Symmetry: D2
Subunit: 422 residues, 4 copies
């Protein structure tokens, strides 16, 4: 896999100097070719989905894997949107004049070579390739075996467009072998890859962090908690909860726990059960709320200790009764994965305290937790949602793949031994 690193590193230097016009031309050709060859991508995706059904995969899993003509048009529109954004490379962050006469400034520069290991999803390949081309980084892709056909078809189109536009062929490359030894080999190619983006569950992150010598920005799993305060409107809160849970349960920003204040549990729980029975979602309630939720039409079962720390990725929910805001904050800190947390309330003080005392990557007040997306946050698209602290956090835009560089200009200036200041 050494030649992979050689090809990526050599292509990165050429890419870093390309003007925005060439990158925009490549992106526009990519979108046009994507829309042109819909019949082959759709056929390959449908065949792969049918093959996946033969292995008894979950319905939500197939829905994530499935690609419709509407989804193809949506990803083409996202490519055009990222083409329409301003190029972050070359932008000036800040500047000034020092007391010694030196003109200082910071300019954004491309990262270099980016290696991404991502889950079985077709659109993520296109999104990553488009973002890396627009920013000016050489990317190396490696996805799950489930999306082998769609990825093999889309990378061919991307490479053909790259050849057509005259850009070096090593800019965007992928690995087709589903072997996991190649992943371990890639994890050790530190001299080529500058930063690695793994998207997956706990096992992939454990294996990567165990045998990594490259900077890693973990996508991380998501356990999103929603806290219902004592003073809140039942009708509005139920709609927000339904939107956060039912719509696309297979994602990561879906709510997994529902912390309910003990003062409002008298009337909120019976209405929640009635709504959830229509929604058809099993409630893994706590012992305290078991008595209240037993009479509800929605089916309810006792919760286990380990159930709080993992995602259901289906129509399931955890119901816990807390004493006050401090208890909910402590529980969120203890069991949360720092992905997304929202509070539904009518009190200003409680909202401010929750915003201040919660360290999740995104905090919402009277809003759904499904807003944690690259497109929803105003950015063109996202490669992953960062749950770590270094470099980017939350959704990743064009800025997340760029670093700055100090530039100084002077008239043969020399640093003085004694730096006086006022």
């Amino acid at each position: 896999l050494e030649q992979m690193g050689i090809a990526a590193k050599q292509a990165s230097y050429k890419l870093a100097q390309l003007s925005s016009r060439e990158k925009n031309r490549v992106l526009e050709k990519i979108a046009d070719e994507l829309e042109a060859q819909s019949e082959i991508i759709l056929n390959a995706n449908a065949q792969d989905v049918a093959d996946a059904r033969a292995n008894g995969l979950s319905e939500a899993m197939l829905d994530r894997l499935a690609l419709t003509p509407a989804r193809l048009k949506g990803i083409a529109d996202d490519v055009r949107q990222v083409c329409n954004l301003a190029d972050p490379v070359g932008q000036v962050i800040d500047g000034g004049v020092l007391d010694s006469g030196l003109r200082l400034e910071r300019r954004r520069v491309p990262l270099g070579v980016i290696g991404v290991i991502y889950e079985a999803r077709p659109n993520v390949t296109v999104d990553v390739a488009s973002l890396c081309l627009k920013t000016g980084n050489a990317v190396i892709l490696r996805g799950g075996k489930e999306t082998c056909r769609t990825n093999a078809a889309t990378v061919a189109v991307i490479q053909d467009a790259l050849k057509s536009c005259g850009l070096p062929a090593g800019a965007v490359q992928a690995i087709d072998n589903p072997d996991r030894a190649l992943v371990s080999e890639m994890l050790r190619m530190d001299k080529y890859i500058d930063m690695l983006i793994p998207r997956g569950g706990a096992g992939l992150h454990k294996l990567c962090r165990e045998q990594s010598t490259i900077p890693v920005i973990t996508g991380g799993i998501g356990v999103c908690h929603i806290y219902v305060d004592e003073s809140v409107e039942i009708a509005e809160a139920l709609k927000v909860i339904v939107n956060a849970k039912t719509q696309r349960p297979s994602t990561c920003n879906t709510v997994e726990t529902l912390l309910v204040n003990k003062n409002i549990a008298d009337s909120f729980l019976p209405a929640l059960s009635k709504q959830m029975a229509e929604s058809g979602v099993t409630l893994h309630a706590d012992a305290a709320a078991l008595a209240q939720l037993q009479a509800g039409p929605a089916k309810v079962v006792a919760v286990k200790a380990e159930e709080y720390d993992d995602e259901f990725l289906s129509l399931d929910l955890n119901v816990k009764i807390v004493s006050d805001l401090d208890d909910a904050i402590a529980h969120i800190r203890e069991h949360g994965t720092q992905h997304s947390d929202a509070i539904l309330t009518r009190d200003m003080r409680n909202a401010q305290r929750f915003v201040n005392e919660v360290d999740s990557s995104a905090v919402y007040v009277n809003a759904s937790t499904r807003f944690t997306d690259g497109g929803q946050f105003g950015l063109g698209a996202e490669v992953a949602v960062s749950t770590q602290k270094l470099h980017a956090r939350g959704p990743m835009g064009l800025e997340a793949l760029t670093t700055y560089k100090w530039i100084g200009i002077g008239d043969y200036t020399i640093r003085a031994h004694h730096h006086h200041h006022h």
Copy 2:
């Protein structure tokens, strides 16, 4: 060492909720006590220098270890300057209104618990503690054995000033034992330390990166190249080179390799030798420049292949003759540590090309390479000079120790299933 992380984590939560008033009060008390206890630090540092000098330590190492009273006043002034900087915690990076009606914004928040492993220098302890206190991070310190007395004396005052203000004791703590097993133990405390800052040579960085489970911002070694173009003024270039080399040769942002254009070598080299003979710097010259430098009064010897990738940390310099700008750029890319690089020229095109094609953390045009400092760059102080590309780069200041958080406010807003855009 588990209690170390427990105390640091417990103190970080309380620290992140403080206001600028208490932090500024503690910083001002720190500066006042530093100026009010000059004799203790002075005598401890003098005793440590006397003990270390008896072990054959290099003169520049003693100069780095020495603490002139003027230097103590300088570090007190730097602390007071930090006290005068605007608090970066709570600042809003950007914001806006989304299409769905959500009000979005990003706010700076403290990183958490910061572990540092620095070289034997007395002022770094004070600078790191002051910056971490101002930002709001709990810091764990571990320095070299050469600075045991001075570091103990300083940390005593720093810990004592915490009690006088009511802040928790676990805010600033250090490890006194120079045992290297404790360093390996700290490297594995991932659940408490959020980010590690190692400052040192190649061996320490290799050891850390080999057994690191914590995000690491490497200080990195410094090999700084200075390029001399065909069209340049000899008198000013000589002064710039002398300022870059002679002044404090024991630092890291000191030029180590001199790249001289072949067209200007015949006139530049004889003057360079005459100027450098006064400074006493031994010129490790290439074979091509050996003939020109032999006649010069300055001491000149042949250079070895491995000598190009190490810091002399003394009054030494490497002289190499290159063909044109492309050769110098290739050599800088091949043998550079991406720390600092400067070009001396009178051609606009060459200057722009050098700024564009060089990926060092700092690039200067007609200026010294000694400007890569926290104080010089406009920041209050620096913890280290980052050479990597993730998170911060170049000098690291108040902003480099803070991360951001998305906050969204709505009125029971729910994400639409299909999102149109224009």
Copy 3:
């Protein structure tokens, strides 16, 4: 007065090129000399206050005119705080690379010659001179006839410091004649003064705007309205109102009208009357609130139609009963002078609506209207509060006195006849 403008214009060109070190030296010397010569300023101010009191000046007016050693130390501290701020001249606002290869950026530059006509206050002279020196603008001062001795002494001190530091003597100059013919003469010197800052009442603003040929940033009069919602805590709202009204009633950011919701008035008014009787403030209640406030210990009188549109500048307040939030917003739009408006409430929706729908220079939620100050808002000091919409708004700091300038660099770039875009 032509020589006045000639000297100011000549001094501005030299000032714009000065470095931050020289400006900081001048500011530090000014502060040191101001502290050294405290007795002369104190004696002159005391004599002027005694002379003014012989003319039956108001107690609040005298307090505004009066200066104490604590106030002198405060203005010295504000001068030093200005000296400690970063120089805004030469800073880069934003930059980038265009599609045609042109490197574009914006750099802050000084405005030029600034003329200011201000009320009889002693500290405004010092603040204006310090800000103009720090930014790099030549200033012309013309104060009220009341503050003659103090302004003359301060101007003499500042001119002596300017002479000592070697800066041109035309940088800071003032007109001592209280004749208003010269004021009309100054309004027509368009070829020298670049921007005018009048501070005063309606008469001065009308006179200036009637005969102005120079850009004007009107200070404007201040009619600040406070709205009390139906759901609010009485104890906290009463303290906020007391702080907003009683403390320094002679300013401009003091509440003059109290809009009370009709649903809460029955309980709010009796407590407000009890508090205001202790505060000793006459209530100019409306007809609707007259019945409720008649039984209150606080003195209450009927209000007049014209009383809503002017400042009392004393211990007086207007009480009006409104139906709902829309009525209060309409009244604020009709009678407000767009200076400062605050709402006290416990409802999130009402707070957001009030923030969105009120076009004032500053809007507060559950806070006093006395925060509209340069020092409070995080800036060093303020020259005036701008109630207009052009250029700066609200408090005017260092960045309010600076303009930007586009700078482009290219390699003999030429604009293409047809500009394609993507």
Copy 4:
């Protein structure tokens, strides 16, 4: 005209609260309808151009008045580019937490009502209307006699789209009376119009600045000077000058004076004459430079003392021999209108000095003065080029029509009488 202001003021309040979705819908519908009704606009423009030639209009003026189908497609593309820009309304400029505990921030808000008095050009109406709709301001338009038909046709389409989208009909309105009494009447409507943007020559600006009570952002006239240094490449400088002069000489950002260094004059003038004769531009040379230019094929005539202070708006140029850089800077300051100035040189020191010492809306180094455009500078479109210093400067984009507003939120915070600081 009172109903005009009444309708504009009523529409402004409703427009300020509109979300970006509705504004984008209106802009997209406007662009689509402009594309659909190309034939009517083309016919009206052709008829107006033919009628203008009956009055002997200048060829450059005719070209400016002429609207080819390609120009119509271009303005539709500019509208669609505006529709793709981020909405500046609601954006946060900066923020933070104060010492007293108040969360401050600044949010952009629409200016209000904007009155535009522009020249005879058909594409300006579309751009002004699109920008005012995108920002959220109500606009009042007043063109010239030569564009009485095309502007009416465009306004009909814009009003039809406004009616279709359901927005208030008073948002965009115009006056179709060439009577100049109405202009003077509009200049005095201070209670409705918040800011006026006049575009024209000296007479219109004198008339507006003589009788007006509204803030004015003057477009001004353009006298762009180009300085040729001693050391410069002849061919590249000649190409840059040809691009700046020949291409569209009817604009404002076109060079009208050539400042040539005396040292390079002998080797530069004959080549300039040879190129200039091919260009066909007449050279209004100075007496000193007349001897060299009297032999070249290009037509040369003596220059008068008043031609230096006005635009030729045709194929004419001024040639003057300066002593050095200081003389050129003095001449530029004396006779320049602060619109655009460029320097062609190969010396870094001279370039930096020229950038620092020259005050203009835009300064270029080795570039063309034809880049001073809204589209070229990265903005979607421009309403005018501001040569003044208040509010915006240079090209005026989307953010130029917006102002900010301080917002503060606290928990019943009250200002303290004594404000401590560190």
